[PDB]
Write a protein that binds this ligand. Structure first.
Ligand SMILES: [Zn+2]
Ligand SMILES: [Zn+2]
Ligand SMILES: [Zn+2]
Lengths: 149, 93
């Protein structure tokens, strides 16, 4: 057993012992390095009441490199493209070994609450978030209803 | 709490960084191979692993905890020694 496996197992124990409120994450079959996560759309955001599915791939040198995390559910957001790739600093240069998958899920939750128009993945959605928020909120809630509900 | 933020197990050969963060000797060692001169908790610059946290080592000798897997009562200073010779732990990995 590698430190990556022991650490992924420890994290799974901790999540069953003290569950999060608006996040479920678990292995897919017997592949401990392949998780699926659900997060709720945050209350007081255009995503509220939507369920969003995420794929989590753990590296074999976890926790010294970040998990690869992508949305499967489609979503209107400046930092998440059609392929479901997430622009998020802690999934890139700001990863640290002390971070856990639950800290990642909460960080992604907050990115739904507070998008990052500067340093975007979808310039068209970034443009709209900056200039006409009500439009972004209209379209985001439109996509949540079609895809996340 | 005497947990290491990197391996999330009870501390083993505890080492204190410049920034006052406490890790297993082997965990802070390993972190500095991957992400060099960087604290794996607070990201602050590090010139080295740090020094033995002998104050933390000392109080762990007077602390106890039941093993997560087999529920036997273990001195915190001996926890690493137990989990590597705990059949349940071994039957998981
Ligand atoms: Zn450790
Ligand atoms: Zn630190
Ligand atoms: Zn045991």
């Amino acid at each position: 057993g590698s430190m990556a496996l022991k650490r992924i197992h420890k994290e799974l124990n901790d999540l069953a012992r003290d569950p999060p409120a608006q996040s479920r994450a678990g292995p897919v079959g017997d592949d401990m390095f392949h998780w699926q996560a659900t997060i709720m759309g945050p209350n007081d955001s255009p995503y509220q009441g939507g369920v969003f599915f995420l794929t989590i791939h753990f590296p074999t040198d976890y926790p010294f490199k970040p998990p690869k995390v992508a949305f499967t559910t489609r979503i209107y957001h400046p930092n998440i493209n059609s392929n479901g790739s997430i622009k998020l600093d802690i999934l890139r240069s700001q990863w640290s070994p002390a971070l856990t998958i639950s800290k990642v899920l909460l960080s992604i939750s907050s990115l739904l609450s507070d998008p990052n128009p500067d340093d975007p993945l979808v310039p068209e959605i970034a443009r709209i978030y900056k200039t006409d928020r009500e439009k972004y909120n209209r379209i985001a809630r439109e996509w949540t209803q079609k895809y996340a509900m | 709490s005497f947990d290491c933020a990197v391996c999330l197990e009870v501390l083993h050969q505890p080492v204190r960084t410049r920034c006052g963060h406490v890790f297993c000797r082997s965990c802070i060692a390993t972190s500095l191979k991957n992400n060099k001169w960087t604290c794996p908790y607070c990201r602050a610059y590090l010139p080295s692993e740090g020094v033995p946290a002998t104050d933390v080592a000392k109080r762990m000798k007077s602390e106890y905890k039941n093993c997560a897997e087999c529920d036997t009562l273990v001195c915190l200073s001996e926890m690493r020694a137990h989990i590597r010779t705990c059949q349940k732990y071994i039957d998981k990995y």
